[PDB]
Amino acid sequence: CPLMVKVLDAVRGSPAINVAVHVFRKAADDTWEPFASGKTSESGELHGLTTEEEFVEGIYKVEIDTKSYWKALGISPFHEHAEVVFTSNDSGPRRYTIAALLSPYSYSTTAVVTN
Amino acid sequence: CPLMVKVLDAVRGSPAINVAVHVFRKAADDTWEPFASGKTSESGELHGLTTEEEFVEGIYKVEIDTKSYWKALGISPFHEHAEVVFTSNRRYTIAALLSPYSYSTTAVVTN
Amino acid sequence: CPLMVKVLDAVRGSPAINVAVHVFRKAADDTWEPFASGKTSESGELHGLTTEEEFVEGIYKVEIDTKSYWKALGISPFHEHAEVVFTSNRRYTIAALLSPYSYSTTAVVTN
Amino acid sequence: CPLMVKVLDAVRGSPAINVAVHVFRKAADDTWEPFASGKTSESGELHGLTTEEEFVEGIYKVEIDTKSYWKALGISPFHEHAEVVFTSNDSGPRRYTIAALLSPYSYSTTAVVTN
Numbered sequence: 001c002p003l004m005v006k007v008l009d010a011v012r013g014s015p016a017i018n019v020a021v022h023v024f025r026k027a028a029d030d031t032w033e034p035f036a037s038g039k040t041s042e043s044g045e046l047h048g049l050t051t052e053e054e055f056v057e058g059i060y061k062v063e064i065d066t067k068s069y070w071k072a073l074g075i076s077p078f079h080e081h082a083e084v085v086f087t088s089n090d091s092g093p094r095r096y097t098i099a100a101l102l103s104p105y106s107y108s109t110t111a112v113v114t115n
Numbered sequence: 116c117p118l119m120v121k122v123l124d125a126v127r128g129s130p131a132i133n134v135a136v137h138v139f140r141k142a143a144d145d146t147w148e149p150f151a152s153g154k155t156s157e158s159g160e161l162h163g164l165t166t167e168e169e170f171v172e173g174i175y176k177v178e179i180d181t182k183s184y185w186k187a188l189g190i191s192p193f194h195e196h197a198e199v200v201f202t203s204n205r206r207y208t209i210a211a212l213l214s215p216y217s218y219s220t221t222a223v224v225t226n
Numbered sequence: 227c228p229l230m231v232k233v234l235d236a237v238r239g240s241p242a243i244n245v246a247v248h249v250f251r252k253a254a255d256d257t258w259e260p261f262a263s264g265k266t267s268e269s270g271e272l273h274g275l276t277t278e279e280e281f282v283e284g285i286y287k288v289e290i291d292t293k294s295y296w297k298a299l300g301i302s303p304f305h306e307h308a309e310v311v312f313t314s315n316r317r318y319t320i321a322a323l324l325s326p327y328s329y330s331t332t333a334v335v336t337n
Numbered sequence: 338c339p340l341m342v343k344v345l346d347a348v349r350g351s352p353a354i355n356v357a358v359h360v361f362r363k364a365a366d367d368t369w370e371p372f373a374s375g376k377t378s379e380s381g382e383l384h385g386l387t388t389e390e391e392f393v394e395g396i397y398k399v400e401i402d403t404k405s406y407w408k409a410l411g412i413s414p415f416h417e418h419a420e421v422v423f424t425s426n427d428s429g430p431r432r433y434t435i436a437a438l439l440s441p442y443s444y445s446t447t448a449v450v451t452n
């Protein structure tokens with residue numbers, strides 16, 4: 001699988017468990033087409049979103065539902081969600097890990113792109 | 116004004132200068148309507164995006180055009196942009212820290 | 227002055243207020259000699275740590291007392307402090323963003 | 338092993354490979370005693386630093402040699418290194434992952450403490 005998503009919690013120092021993640025791909029008319037979704041495991045990781053076959057070059061949006069994560073913990077968050085938007089490229093390395101570190105009023109996201 | 120945007124370059128340790136920023140507000144038909152736009156100054160700050168009268172309650176999206184920033188500096192980054200989405204109901208400062216394959220964003224909300 | 231320290235609270239989305247900061251400078255016998263100290267104001271800023279005359283070349287350590295900050299707010303954090311170590315040879319702004327189990331730190335260096 | 342260290346590179350979007358990591362523990366006289374060391378693998382991770390037997394409660398410093406990492410890539414860095422200082426606690430969870438995301442003038446560090 002060429003796309004993995006991992007989410008961590010900076011308040012409790014733990015994986016962010018059961019976080020909904022929605023992936024979209026930009027359609028030719030510039031709207032966002034649903035592409036894949038899931039929820040992070042107990043390790044904070046979401047595997048198996050897609051296959052090499054279906055992960056063609058294009059612009060993708062990964063939406064991490066941070067607001068519902070914080071509310072389910074009883075914590076008031078700022079953002080509606082975390083959005084990661086990128087163009088995949090076949091010339092570059094094969095595997096994309098999208099990682100997000102969450103705080104209630106802040107988040108960081110990084111791409112680890114490897115083979 | 117009630118909404119300010121600050122952008123820093125983590126590779127250079129400098130303000131991110133000339134960064135375009137587009138603000139959208141979700142419309143009654145839940146599409147993104149253009150709201151305001153501008154670009155950061157030499158301090159990395161974007162002031163005067165809006166007014167207290169116009170910054171009404173709603174769901175806002177601050178799009179920071181990071182890809183155009185890095186490309187103007189001769190670099191091919193990972194992200195298309197950095198999108199900060201929040202509901203407003205007060206001064207908001209939206210801060211972002213940029214690296215070619217990473218960004219961090221924080222909200223500082225005061226009165 | 228040539229050295230300023232800014233601290234933000236990522237849980238609250240606010241300046242980190244009353245944060246103690248101790249600056250050290252490596253001595254000729256490579257131990258850490260105390261250099262200056264202070265604490266952040268209501269803006270989360272610490273101005274006036276030193277002067278251009280006293281901020282000579284050297285290896286500096288800015289210790290931000292994050293543990294005491296979180297504990298004063300009733301919270302048990304992970305880190306003892308946040309230590310920023312750098313060589314100087316110009317205004318340095320040392321910025322830190324704090325969560326109970328995480329911190330980020332950036333250097334903004336200008337003239 | 339109760340202590341793992343992982344390092345990522347935010348400029349290239351990759352693991353930070355071959356980064357020297359030194360761990361110290363505070364001695365009774367308040368000096369830092371060498372405790373363990375290694376270099377990150379090709380996955381950016383450093384396993385096997387210590388055992389449960391030797392990782393007693395105490396104050397530990399993890400020093401990540403970021404400056405040598407950036408210089409070996411030909412990139413001018415700001416910090417001498419990244420320091421993570423914490424008190425381990427036996428009552429809390431069993432495993433400590435110390436993770437650091439590196440940029441030349443910035444770094445982030447987080448603790449993932451699990452079982």
Ligand SMILES: O=C(O)c1cc(-c2ccc(F)cc2F)ccc1O
Nearest residue numbers: 099100101108109110436438445447
């Ligand atoms: O920007 C981010 O998402 C980020 C991520 C990490 C991180 C990455 C991978 C991992 F297994 C653990 C981490 F803490 C550490 C710091 C950080 O800022």
Ligand SMILES: O=C(O)c1cc(-c2ccc(F)cc2F)ccc1O
Nearest residue numbers: 210211212219220221321323330332
């Ligand atoms: O999330 C962010 O936007 C962020 C911002 C800063 C930062 C903000 C303002 C400033 F003058 C200097 C900084 F390093 C530092 C770290 C960081 O993560």
Ligand SMILES: O=C(O)c1cc(-c2ccc(F)cc2F)ccc1O
Nearest residue numbers: 210212219221321322323330331332
């Ligand atoms: O590394 C940091 O210290 C850092 C700092 C900021 C930040 C700095 C200054 C400010 F006025 C607001 C901020 F969110 C935002 C993100 C960040 O990582």
